[PDB]
Design a protein around this ligand. Structure first.
Ligand SMILES: c1ccc(Cn2ccnc2)cc1
Length: 119
C-alpha cells in the first residue's frame, strides 16, 4: 500500500533496459541527419534518456504516464520500419516483451495502493 514505491521500481527497470543490448537504438533521440524524413512520419519522438530525465525531474505523477511514453518508443519503431523483419524493429519487439513482463506488477501495486488510500 506504498503510493510512492513505483518511482524507484521504474528507476531500477530503466537501469535493466539500458544494460540490455536490444536498447542501443533507443537510448537517445533518433538522429535527424541519419533519418532526414523522420519528423514527416513521427509526430512525437520519444527515447529512454528522455523518459529517465522526465522521471528524475519529478514530472511523472504515476507509473501509467511513464508506461504511455515507453509504449510510444515502440509504436514509433513500428510506424518507421520499412518491414516487419527489420533489425531495429526486431530489437523493439523483444524489448517491448521484456518491459511489459516487468511493468505489470508496478502498475498493479500502485493501483492497489491508491484504492486502499481512498477505501
Ligand atoms: C526501423 C525502425 C525504426 C528506425 C528509426 N530508428 C533508428 C534508431 N532507432 C529508431 C529505423 C528502422
Amino acid at each position: 500500500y506504498d503510493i510512492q514505491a513505483w518511482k524507484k521500481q521504474c528507476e531500477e527497470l530503466l537501469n535493466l533496459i539500458f544494460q540490455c543490448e536490444d536498447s542501443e537504438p533507443f537510448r537517445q533521440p533518433v538522429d535527424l541527419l541519419e533519418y532526414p524524413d523522420y519528423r514527416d512520419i513521427i509526430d512525437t519522438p520519444m527515447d529512454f534518456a528522455t523518459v529517465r530525465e522526465t522521471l528524475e525531474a519529478g514530472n511523472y505523477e504515476s507509473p501509467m504516464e511513464l508506461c504511455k511514453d515507453v509504449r510510444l518508443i515502440f509504436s514509433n519503431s513500428k510506424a518507421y520500419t520499412p518491414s516487419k523483419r527489420s533489425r531495429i524493429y526486431s530489437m523493439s519487439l523483444r524489448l517491448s516483451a521484456f518491459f511489459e513482463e516487468h511493468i505489470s506488477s508496478v502498475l498493479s501495486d500502485y493501483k492497489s495502493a491508491l484504492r486502499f488510500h481512498k477505501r
